[PDB]
Structures are given as C-alpha cells and as structure tokens.
C-alpha cells in the first residue's frame, strides 16, 4: 500500500493520486 | 543525498496537497 510504495520505496504522482477519494 | 521517500506526517501532507477537494482516507502506522 501507500507506505510500502511511497515511504519504503519511491512513488510517482499518479500512484499517489490513486489513493485519493 | 536528497531523500525522495515520503513518510509519516510528510506522506499525509502529500495526500492533502494532491487530493485537494476530493479528500482521502489514511491510516497512520503510529
């Protein structure tokens, strides 16, 4: 999920955006 | 070297920015 994708690893804008409501 | 990881309060601030008026759900690990 978001912590593994963006904290442990590095994520891109549309990966982040997909977590939005 | 500069750190690209987004963790903790920095991660929820990123969501606040990108999600804008759409909002979001989030669960702190803390």
Residue numbers in the entry:
A (entry chain A): 1 to 21
B (entry chain B): 1 to 30
Any passages from the paper?
In the cases of [PheB26]-insulin and [GlyB26]-insulin, we aimed to investigate the structural consequences of the loss of the TyrB26 side-chain hydroxyl group or the whole TyrB26 side chain, respectively. Only the previously reported PheB26 mutant had less than 50% potency. The loss of the phenolic side chain in [PheB26]-insulin also results in a ∼20% decrease (2–3 kcal mol−1) in the B26 side chain–insulin interaction energy. Although the dimer interface is maintained in this structure, the release of the PheB26 side chain from the water-mediated (Wat1) hydrogen bond to (NH)CO of GlyB8 (typical of wild-type TyrB26) leads to relaxation of this surface. The Cα–Cα distances between wild-type (TyrB26) insulin and [PheB26]-insulin increase from ∼1 Å at the B25 site to 6.3 Å at LysB29.
Insulin is a 51-amino-acid protein hormone with two disulfide-linked chains (A1–A21 and B1–B30) that is responsible for the maintenance of metabolic homeostasis, with an impact on cell proliferation and regulation of ageing. It exerts its functions through binding as a monomer to the tyrosine kinase-type IR, which is an (αβ)2 heterotetramer in which each individual αβ extracellular chain comprises L1, CR, L2, FnIII-1, FnIII-2 and FnIII-3 domains. Therefore, we undertook further mutagenesis-driven studies of insulin, focusing on the TyrB26 site that we assumed might be the critical structural pivot of insulin conformational activation on its receptor.
